[PDB]
């Protein structure tokens, strides 16, 4: 396969208590079923490269990560070209094709977080194509 996709992490929340900046998230799918997500984050004056491998389950949109200990649910938003990631701490994230905030996507993301019992004060992340310490 070696199929690919590019995205922006636009907002996050959790059931508990934050990047200064983020680069785009890049996903690569591997023969076998797994996805690998990569993003770079500016935090405490430093650029952190994050990689997460999401392992296939028998259910579409549901993966395992962090040596089995995290379960991740990914689903399309009703708002065009956005997705919501839910993880269990318990966290949710809003991904979009467009770096600029969609108020509609944000609104739906709030209602999603409430259903999941997450903190309803959504953090919107600033975007930058490259990470400058």
């Amino acid at each position, epitope marked *: 396969v070696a199929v*690919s996709g*590019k995205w922006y992490l636009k907002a996050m929340t959790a059931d508990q208590e934050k990047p200064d900046s983020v680069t785009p998230m890049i996903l690569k799918a591997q023969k076998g079923g797994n996805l690998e997500a990569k993003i770079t984050m500016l935090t405490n004056g430093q650029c952190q490269n994050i990689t997460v491998v999401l392992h296939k389950t028998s259910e579409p949109g549901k993966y395992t990560a962090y040596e089995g200990q995290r379960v991740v649910f990914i689903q399309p938003s009703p708002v065009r070209d956005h997705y919501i990631l839910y993880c269990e701490i318990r966290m949710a994230k809003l991904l979009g094709r467009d770096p600029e905030q969609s108020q509609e996507a944000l609104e739906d993301f709030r209602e999603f977080s409430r259903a999941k019992g997450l903190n309803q004060e959504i953090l919107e992340l600033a975007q930058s194509e490259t990470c400058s310490p």
Partner: antibody
Amino acid sequence: QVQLVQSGAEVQKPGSSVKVSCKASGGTFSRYPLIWVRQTPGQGLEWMGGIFPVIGRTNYAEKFQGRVTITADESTSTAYMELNSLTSEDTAVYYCARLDTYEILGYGTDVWGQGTTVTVSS
Amino acid sequence: EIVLTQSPATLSLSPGERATLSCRASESVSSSVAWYQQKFGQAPRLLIYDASNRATGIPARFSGSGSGTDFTLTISSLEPEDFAVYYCQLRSNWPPLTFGGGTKVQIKR
């Protein structure tokens, strides 16, 4: 592996309606767009409409709005396309297809039915 | 509505030649574009999804590119079996899923 099996070839009189079925086996449409596409002989592909679970709605192309009805029945894993007020120009091959779009990134495992020929003639 | 324009609508080439096919959306549609091959009397065959991803089994000579409004299908070097009509299509969880008008790739003489 999901398969879509359509009802067979139909002959309908001008003015009548045709209802074409599309049965899913090995899977369902609950998380995936189920769409209808036609092609008139020797001509191009035209999207007619579809069921779009992400927005909880069935939507139609302008050209067919008001003359086509698309439905599905969960219990029978079957989707349907009804085209009213047939004229000779609706003579075409009609296809259903389930689009593999649910995953943020997937393998493009779209599934098409085999096609149903509808011939409009008295 | 969103319209997909495939222009030119005919290309006349030969085995050995590169084929570059164009599909232009009437407004931005990100990466939500598929390409199909269709030969006369046969069912459409998916080549590309998400603008740049090959479907399973599709040979490497077929590549898709673009994001936004301007999409391209390139066949690096045409083989005999590649003369067909090619369609682009909006492909996504969200409507509309409009097709382009098609580009016929024929043999020049």
